[PDB]
């Protein structure tokens, strides 16, 4: 019979009765959230987690202070994978209510897609959902081509075809073209390459296609905000099975750019599918290429997305977007010497450095750079380590966080001078 | 523009400037290799490894001392799996240049075959390559019969059919007959039985068909040296998948000689395919049977091939060949009591001793002896533990070494009084 | 009889006879090192490793190009833990030859100390060696006080006394005062706090006192270059035994600043000894505090030292020093939220985050910040992950690298406007 929980913002701290530095308090007026000057949006999100934690499922944001960002902060923390939670929003200006509504649609899409079980999300399905998303936000501007199964082998997509080899669900390359102007000669300004491993050998496993989902949301959100420039999106999608008829260990893949790659580590195959997408993206000769992949051991925890580039100014541009969108990103090393740290006894390079050069995300980024024509300027690689939460934490429920979507979209908009 | 590196042999040790007991030195004349009286061929091989190690890819053997064995020693160490290295040989007598050229062709075949990825080398492919090799060296003398897939089940090759069961690449038995004389009644003097596991559950994995390749090279090399006697070769070939539709754990195989074998250890399946080959070889009633299998924990390291027989005089004959061909072999125990050390709760015997009789290569040899009619005379088993090098070492690059080919071929020639 | 190997620098690449992009070549003139425009000092160091690798022990740097940095680059790579290698230097200006000679003395001290077996380097010994080093470079300016064994308990050094508890070699705090001016009222400008674990439960173990050695070298090198400002150095030294009479698991330490710390992880005890040093350093009210500790899982590899601070401008100052001294440093995250990520069921905080907040070096830095009075300005923490090499690599032999000494010394000099 309605009478929903009202949630309000105060800058005076709670009574002593609630204990020290109590973040939330609750009386007849509803729940109050107690803020200081330092990190209000973090405090609001943690409060939305606790409120959810107490088993409350419907809330009304009430009283003053509920701008776009406070409201979004709340929702990010209040929401859960089961999707039972509702929120009666506060009054907002016309601009901000549309921004809220399109964030909700597009970023919750990203969370659901990453949270979905791998049985319900195969390679071609993931491609289909991405198209469906982009065609909802702006259909006239979008076109695509799916190259699936044998068509991949037939056109020398050795990386994607090989990684997918073992499975009943055929590997898929989605090439998607977001072209607003109509002009088919219009120059391609950015290429986005996403890791779409829909099943991984060794439930963190369902987060291995999170790079694809996150860039699909980034493009969609950018377009929803009216991105004028043309953008190509490559989702490199495959199941990654290692046992038996997948024939993975020791396999050498000849890529179209002449590179040979031994598979030493049958689990590190996201970089193998990405290499093919990176070859296509470099043939477009765009001034920006961004690729995103999860799970490439990290010392940032799940708190930061990591970025790797040789281009200092471009790494800074992304960090600037990340700050403007209140998302945590952090730069990690990628120097020239990493490119030598993947030798092989049987091929030009190995897929990992292994135990001979105890490395991780820098070497994974270094490996991809062998498939980017001008790797030194205009290329970004994102290890999406803020994408998934095994268990619930302070500010997040279990599962996909949705982080990174705002930040990349902001960067593309910035390129287009918007 | 040519001007190749010259490599020469000296018996005076290097200047103090190079350090103590310096093996190689380099000046305007090229690289000198410094030898003592003890183990020159070992020293030469290690020097060829270092020279390769310094990134030199083309050399000319120069000056005096470069006999057949010094030259071969060098090549063995100089060569690498990638096969970029060339050597301008020294002048040799007619006899020795043909021996060098046929060693090169046949032993490098063995290395490439063992080094090849398992994706590029299935059961039937391995059989096809072996035939191709033997028909290159002497075609008129060779005939064969391939029994593949269902034909194996249909003819009660339960061991080979079962081990291969799980895979998309069907198991294969190659029966190959090297008969020079033409006379089809000519008595079969030796049977060779090779372990051809083309894929193994748990990149050392691609070396699990090395017994087959090594005996295929042995026969080929013997024939190239004009082996007059008739020899049968059985390559027992299969993928060894253990997960899922391979249905491996606890399976009982009824062999044609009435034996039942439980599979306790799903990884120890090379002996299972060999058992079928050993049944066929014993029906030929030849005075010599040799079988070869890799990976049957060893305390010889990768430095020695191991041999097992009940026949003292025959074990000595092989050790004599091994010394004549400067290859390292070493005898390990095989007494009667080992034959009791494989009991089973559900079958006549288990495929391993397990943890009840902490054993390894002796018990594996003991198990095979239950499939050799007269196991007590005229049967040799070789655990090929010198066949593969995970990482590069003093005298060898990574990968297949090619060792054992010379030694077995020398033994067959000895049988034929040649 | 002398006739030493001459090593020279060329900018033309080697003959084809040596292979592609050959770094070194060797003829009658000696070894030539072949450089391009990109990273000459890296190339020179790798060449010194290879030359050492070929077993050469005495060299003469010859011809033009051998400035201070080229010469140092060479030595860093040429040297080995066994210390058999000699180098006849090239002619240098007066300034640079003294810089070379004092680098050699001070940085090779750091390497030997870190390379020394733990049996030959107890807590008090480490303190004694540090004093000895600093008194060699400038004796009149140095004074100290050693607080050892029971004196630590008696003066509420609970962290150091507890970590050391189990061992036959008593824990030690070295407070060392480098005061050039003489004036005892002279303001203390920097405090340096070093982790001196002389034995660690679970031969990478002997590198666990590398923070202490590295800062001892930094101060010594700075003083050798005439550092005018006053600096205090705190070496927090102890054996870290965990089994039996060490009584480590679950112990709660009450520190002088009122903090209680449960020991959840008996291996993470370097931070426990540092906490006491950090309390002392904060009582000096200096505008700079630097602490250094090894082994606090990293994704930089052994290629970068990591730094953590809340002070942006100070983190940049250190990165600037690191670039001026051609050493690799890299910043890692340390935000306010990390300070909450070490809760305890039994004390104010745990010594680690554990498996509840899968973290590493950020949480270790966050933990130390609870013992720095004004942690927000003027405090740096260095995880010394470039300090030790388990095995030999491209540019380094096995063992202690000596990196970080130049960089910290440069920062102190910069503070003093020098």
- For residues C115 and C178, membership in a common domain is answered with yes
* Closest by CA position to C372, among listed C312, C314, C309: C309
- Looking from the CA of B91 toward its CB, the CA atoms found within 13 Å total 2
Q: Which residue, B210, B178, B180, is CA-closest to B191?
A: B178
Give dist(CA A348, CA A344) in Å, integer.
6
CA distance B203 to chain A (A): 6
C208 C-beta neighbours (distance < 10 Å), count: 26
Q: Is there a single domain that holds both residue B59 and residue B142?
A: no
Token pair in block for residue C183: 């004036």
Q: Do B56 and C19 touch (CB under 8 A)?
A: yes
Does one domain contain both C56 and C192?
Answer: no
| Closest chain B residue to the Cα of A356, Cα to Cα | B391
Closest C-chain CA to B85: C19
CB contact, 8 Å: B198 with chain A? Answer: no
Please tell me the distance from the alpha carbon of residue A172 to that of residue A127, in angstroms, as a whole number. Answer: 8
Cα separations in angstroms, A368 against A255, A274, A309, A360, C211: 12, 8, 11, 13, 35
Q: Any long-range contacts for C320-326 (C-beta under 8 Å, 24+ apart)? A: C320/C414, C321/C407, C321/C408, C321/C410, C321/C411, C321/C414, C322/C407, C324/C410, C325/C406, C325/C407, C325/C410, C326/C41, C326/C69
C contact chains, 3+ CB pairs < 8 A: A, B
Smallest Cα–Cα separation from B277: which of B410, B411, B152? B152
Residues of C in contact with B20 (CB under 8 A): 55
A299–chain C nearest CA distance, Å:
6
Out of B80, B82, B205, the one facing A249 most closely (by C-beta) is: B205
Q: How far is CA C226 from the centre of its chain?
A: 20
Instruction: Report d(CA C4, CA C8) in Å as an integer.
Output: 13
Is residue A57 within 8 A of residue A86, CB to CB? The reply is yes
**Any known ligand binding at B269?**
yes
What are the C-alpha distances in Å from A82 to residues A7, A108, A218, A389, C149?
Answer: 22, 12, 23, 15, 58
The partner residues of A32 in beta bridges, in order of sequence, read A8, A25
Residues of chain A positioned with their CB less than 8 A from the CB of C304: 333
Quick one: residue C47, left, alpha or beta (phi over 0 = left, psi -120 to 50 = alpha)? alpha
H helices present in B142-201, as ranges: 150-154, 158-163
Is residue B177 within 8 A of residue B142, CB to CB? The reply is: yes
- B61 and B132 co-located in one domain: no
The per-residue DSSP string of C217-285 comes to HHHHHHHHTT--SEEEEEEEEEEE--SGGG--TT-EEE-TTS-EEE-S-TT--HHHHHHHHHHHHHHTT
- At C212, which helix (H) or strand (E)? helix C210-224
Give me the sign of the Cα torsion angle B71, B74, B76, B80. Answer: negative
Between the CA atoms of B126, B130, B132 and B134, what dihedral angle is there, to the nearest 10 degrees?
A: 180
Chain B interface includes C392 (CB < 8 A): no
Select the residue of C42, C302, C332 nearest A299 (Cβ to Cβ): C332
Quick one: CA torsion of C380, C384, C386, C391, rounded to 10 degrees?
180
Binding residues of C: 195, 200, 208, 267, 269
The whole-angstrom separation of Cα C380 and Cα C375 is 9
Q: How was this structure determined?
A: X-ray
Chains that touch A (3 or more CB pairs under 8 A): B, C
CA distances from C125 to A203, C81, C194 (A): 51, 20, 15
In Å, how far from its chain's centre is CA C350?
26
Residues of A in contact with C295 (CB under 8 A): none
Residues A328 and A219 in one domain: yes
Let me know: does C239 contact C169? Beta carbons within 8 Å.
Answer: yes
- Phi/psi class of residue A247: alpha, beta or left (left: φ > 0; alpha: ψ in -120 to 50)? left
3-state helix, strand, coil in chain C (%, to 5): 35, 20, 40
Integer-rounded Cα radius of gyration of chain A: 22
Choose, out of B54, B62, B80, the residue to mutate when testing the contact with C (most C CBs < 10 Å). B54
Residues of chain A positioned with their CB less than 8 A from the CB of B208: none
Does the annotation place B248 within a ligand binding site? Answer: no
Closest C-alpha among C276, C16, C52, C83 to residue C162: C276
- Locus of tokens 């302070």: A394
Question: Taking Cα atoms as reference points, which of A7, A163, A158 lies closest to residue A70?
Answer: A7
Number of independent structural domains in chain B: 2
Annotated binding site of C for Mn(2+): 195, 200, 208, 267, 269
Residue finishing a domain among B92, B125, B154: B92
Task: Tell me the residue length of chain C.
Answer: 418
Task: Give the CA radius of gyration of chain C.
Answer: 22
Structural domain containing residue B347: 93-418
Beta bridge partners of C256: none
In 3D space, the residue among B209, B380, B378 whose CA is nearest the CA of residue B293 turns out to be: B209
Q: Are B289 and B242 in contact (CB under 8 A)?
A: no
CA distance C365 to C380: 9
Nearest CA in chain A to B398: A345
Q: Are C73 and C89 in contact (CB under 8 A)?
A: no
**B304 Cβ neighbours under 8 A, 6+ residues apart:** B328, B329, B330, B385, B386
- What's the CA gap between B219 and A313, in Å, rounded? 65
Chain B residues whose CB is inside 8 A of the C58 CB are 17
**b or e along A137-174 (b: 16 or more beta carbons within 10 Å of the residue's beta carbon)?**
beeebbebebbbbebbeeeebbbbbbbbbbbebbbbbb
Contact C357 A38 (CB under 8 A): no
- Find chain A residues with C-beta within 8 A of C39's C-beta: 336-337
d(CA C108, CA C111): 5
Contact of B126 with B113, CB cutoff 8 Å? yes
Q: How buried is residue A301: exposed, middle or buried, by Cβ count under 10 Å (0-12/13-18/19+)?
A: buried
Q: Contact at 8 Å (CB) between A268 and A351? A: yes
Exposure letters C124-154 (e unless 16+ CB within 10 A, then b): bbbbebbbebbbebeeebbebebbbbebbee
Are residues B304 and B416 located together in one domain of the fold? yes
CB contact under 8 A, B17 and C55: no
Put simply, whether A302 touches C (Cβ < 8 Å) is: yes
Q: Measured between alpha carbons, how far is C100 from C96 in angstroms, rounded to an integer?
A: 6
- CB contact A136 to B (< 8 Å): no
- Do the strands A399-400 and A388-389 form a parallel or antiparallel pair, or are they unpaired? antiparallel
Do residues B135 and B65 share a domain? no
> What is the H or E stretch that residue C33 is in?
strand C30-34
Q: Which two tokens stand for residue A407?
A: 């930040």
| A252 vs B contacts (CB less than 8 Å) | 117, 120
* C27 min Cα distance to partner chain B (Å): 5
Considering the domain architecture, whether residues A236 and A182 belong to the same structural domain is answered as yes
Given in angstroms, what resolution was this structure solved at?
Answer: 2.8
Nearest CA in chain B to A266: B203
Which of B:102-131 have CB within 8 Å of C? none
- Nearest-by-CA chain B residue for C17: B4
Measured between its terminal Cα atoms, the distance across chain A in Å is: 46
Instruction: Provide the pairing of β-strand B58-61 with B5-10.
Output: parallel
Tell me the two tokens of residue A242: 């290692």
CA distance A358 to A341: 10
User: SS3 string of chain A?
Assistant: CCCCEEEEEECCCCCHHHCCCCCEEEECCEEEEECCCCCHHHHHHHHHHHHHHCCCCEEEECCCCCCHHHHHHHHHHHCCCCCCCEEECCCCCHHHHHHHHHHHHHHHHHHHHHHCCHHHCCHHHHHHHHHHHHHHHCCCCEEEEEEECHHHHHCCCHHHHHHCCCCCCCCEEEEEEECCCCCCCCCEEEEEEEEEEEEECCCHHHHCCHHHHHHHHHHHHHHHCCCCCEEEEEEEEEEECCCHHHCCCCCEEECCCCCEEECCCCCCCHHHHHHHHHHHHHHCCCCEEEEEECCCCCCCCCCCEEEECCCHHHHHHHHHHHHHCCCCEEECCCCHHHHHCCCCCCCCEECCCCCCCCCCHHHHHHHHHCCCCCCCCCEEEEECCCCEECCCCCCCCCEECCCCHHHHHHHHHHHCCC
Instruction: Give the SS3 label for residue B411.
Output: helix
- Chain C: closest CA distance from residue A48 (Å): 17
For testing contact with chain A, the best of B113, B114, B117 (most A CBs within 10 A): B117
Residue of C nearest to B47 (CA): C54
Residues C19 and C85 in one domain: yes
Query: What token pair was written down for A383?
Result: 């290890």
* DSSP code for B417: T
Under 8 Å between Cβ of B270 and B195: yes
Q: Residues 56..95 of C with a Cβ closer than 8 Å to B: which? A: 56-58
Pick the residue of B2, B7, B16, B17 with the most C CBs within 10 A to test the interface with C by mutation. Answer: B17
- What would the DSSP string read from start to end of C105-147? HHHHHHHHHHHS-GGG--HHHHHHHHHHHHHHH-STTEEEEEE
Alpha-carbon distance of B104 to A245, in angstroms, equals: 34
Q: Which residues of B303-337 are buried (b: 16+ CB within 10 A; e: fewer)?
A: ebbbbbbbbeebbebbbebbeebebbbeebebeee
Indicate if C131 and C229 belong to the same structural domain. yes
Contact A21, A12 (CB under 8 A): no
Which among C38, C298, C394 has the least Cβ separation from residue A336? C38
- How many CB atoms neighbour CB A327 within 10 A? 20
B170 and B283 co-located in one domain: yes
**How far from A147 is each of A143, A150, A173, A234, B252, CA to CA, in Å?**
14, 9, 5, 11, 45
> What is the token pair recorded at C219?
């101060």
Determine contact: A168 vs chain B, CB below 8 A. no
Q: Please give the sequence-ordered ranges of beta strands (E in DSSP) within B179-215, or none if there are none.
A: 188-200
Angstroms from B298 CA to nearest CA on chain C: 26
SS3 for B288?
Answer: strand
Active-site residue, from B271, B331, B339, B389 = B271
Shortest CA distance from B20: residue in chain C: C55
Cα C21-C27-C32 angle, rounded to 5 deg: 50
CB under 8 A, 24+ apart: contacts of C354-358 = C354/C264, C354/C265, C357/A301, C357/A393, C358/A301, C358/A302
- Domain boundary, last residue among A92, A110, A127: A92
B391 in reach of chain C (CB within 8 A): no
The answer to whether C166 and C247 are in contact (CB under 8 A) is: yes
Domain match, A176 and A40 both: no
Last-in-domain residue among C62, C92, C122: C92
Binding residues of A for Mn(2+): 195, 200, 208, 267, 269
A70 vs A90: CA distance, rounded Å: 10
Is B267 annotated in some ligand binding site?
Answer: yes
A252 in contact with B, Cβ within 8 Å: yes
Q: Do C54 and B54 touch (CB under 8 A)?
A: yes
Q: Which residues of A are catalytic?
A: 271
Structure tokens at B137: 């060296």
């Amino acid at each position: 019979t309605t009478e929903i929980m009202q949630i309000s913002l105060s800058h005076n701290p709670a009574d002593a009765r609630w204990g020290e530095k109590a973040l939330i308090s609750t009386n007849d007026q509803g729940v109050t959230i107690h803020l200081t000057s330092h990190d209000q949006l973090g405090g609001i999100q943690r409060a939305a987690r606790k409120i959810d934690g107490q088993g409350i499922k419907q809330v009304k944001l009430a009283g003053e202070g509920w701008g776009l960002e406070q409201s979004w902060a709340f929702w990010q923390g209040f929401r859960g994978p089961k999707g039972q939670r509702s929120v009666v929003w506060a009054e907002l200006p016309a601009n901000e209510k549309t921004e809220l509504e399109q964030r909700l649609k597009i970023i919750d899409w990203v969370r659901d897609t990453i949270n979905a079980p791998a049985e319900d999300l195969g390679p071609e399905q993931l491609a289909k959902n991405a198209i469906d998303l982009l065609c909802a936000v702006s259909c006239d501007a979008v076109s695509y081509r799916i190259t699936k199964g044998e068509d991949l082998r037939e056109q020398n997509y050795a990386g994607i075809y090989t990684v997918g080899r073992g499975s009943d669900r055929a590997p898929v390359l989605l090439a998607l073209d977001y072209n607003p102007t109509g002009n088919p000669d219009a120059p391609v300004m950015a290429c986005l390459v996403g890791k779409g491993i829909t099943f991984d050998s060794g439930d963190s496993m369902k987060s291995d296609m999170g790079g694809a989902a996150t860039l699909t949301g980034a493009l969609a959100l950018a377009a929803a905000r009216g991105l004028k420039e043309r953008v190509k999106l490559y989702l490199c999608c495959a199941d990654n099975m290692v046992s038996g008829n997948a024939f993975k260990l020791g396999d050498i893949i000849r890529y179209r750019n002449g590179k040979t790659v031994e598979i030493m580590n049958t689990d590190a195959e996201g970089r193998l599918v990405l290499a093919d997408g990176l070859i296509d993206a470099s043939e477009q000769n765009a001034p920006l290429i961004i690729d995103a992949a999860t799970l490439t051991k990290t010392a940032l925890g799940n708190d930061y997305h990591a970025l790797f580039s040789f281009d200092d100014e471009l790494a800074q541009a992304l960090l600037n977007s990340a700050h403007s969108e209140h998302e945590l990103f952090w730069r990690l090393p990628l120097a020239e010497f990493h490119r030598s740290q993947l030798p092989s006894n049987f091929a030009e390079l190995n897929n990992v450095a292994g135990g001979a050069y105890s490395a991780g995300a820098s070497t994974a980024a270094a490996f991809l750079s062998h498939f980017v024509k001008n790797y030194q300027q205009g290329w970004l690689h994102i290890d999406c380590s803020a994408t998934y939460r095994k268990s619930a934490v302070d500010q997040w429920s279990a599962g996909a966080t949705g982080l990174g979507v705002r930040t990349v979209a902001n960067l593309l908009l910035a390129q287009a001078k918007q």
